[PDB]
Amino acid sequence: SEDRIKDLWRDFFRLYGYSDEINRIHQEYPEVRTLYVSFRDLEDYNWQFAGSILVSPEIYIRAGEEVILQDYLLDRVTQRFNIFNLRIKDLEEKAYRIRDIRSANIGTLISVSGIVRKNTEVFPKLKNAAFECSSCHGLTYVEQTENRLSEPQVCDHCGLSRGKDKIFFKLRPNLSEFIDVQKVEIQEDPPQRITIITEDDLAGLLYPGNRVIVDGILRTEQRRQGNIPLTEFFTYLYAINVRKDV
Ligand SMILES: [Zn+2]
């Protein structure tokens, strides 16, 4: 249950003394909107809960973020400004060579190490999209999670929908929230390669030659032979935490 997961986060933040840090972030939100939580603390709290985070990080991390937004930051949160990053650190004691990654790892939180070989420019990605209702001209915000734009079906202000009422929504970029994104390709230390997606506070940190360890969610991306959809995919890592060394 989502409610049960949120309840577990609520007790955790309090028990392990994160409330003070969160309240400090509160003073600087939304300019500051990231909290790092120690996996060592999570394990000490409830090792089943800790293990579940490794298996279903998107669901568990999102739940934690909701608790922070609803219970701690609410008076600084709006329909537009509702972004928060809950990140996990201190996973080093709890790792895969790039060549050892398999399909069984997809959707889970793993750690990968390598040398940075390439990076893209830092570019903006739509994160919280403002949509204007053709009827009442009110704004419905929709969080974006995919490469393709997710549009609303029903208006949050007047309750009409595209299907039954034939209304349409107009994207309003200037009223939307964007985040920085950067893709970084790493290679095994002599070798296979994998791409890491770094977003928001993690974008713009990695450069060619850097030795990195990245904790992230293993994702899949579809191969395309120009237009045509293939069943062949490749894996990439969505970064949750990044560490460098020389
Ligand atoms: Zn409307």
Topology:
Elements: H1 2-15, H2 19-26, E1 34-38, H3 39-45, H4 47-55, H5 57-72, E2 85-89, E3 109-119, E4 123-133, E5 139-143, H6 162-165, E6 169-171, E7 177-187, E8 193-199, E9 211-225, E10 228-245
Parallel strand pairs: 1-2, 8-10
Antiparallel strand pairs: 3-7, 3-9, 4-5, 4-6, 4-7, 7-8, 9-10
Residues 133, 135-136, 138, 155, 157-158, 160 line the site of zinc ion.
Record the strand order, biggest sheet.
3-7-8-10-9
Name the bound molecules.
zinc ion
Q: What is the CATH superfamily classification of the largest domain?
A: Nucleic acid-binding proteins
The fold-level CATH name of the largest domain is OB fold (Dihydrolipoamide Acetyltransferase, E2P)
How many strand units?
10
- Assign an overall shape: globular
Strand content: 35-45%
Distance between the termini: 43 Å
Domain unit count: 3
- Based on CA atoms alone, the radius of gyration comes out at 20 Å
Family: Belongs to the MCM family.
Protein name: DNA helicase
Organism: Thermoplasma acidophilum (strain ATCC 25905 / DSM 1728 / JCM 9062 / NBRC 15155 / AMRC-C165)
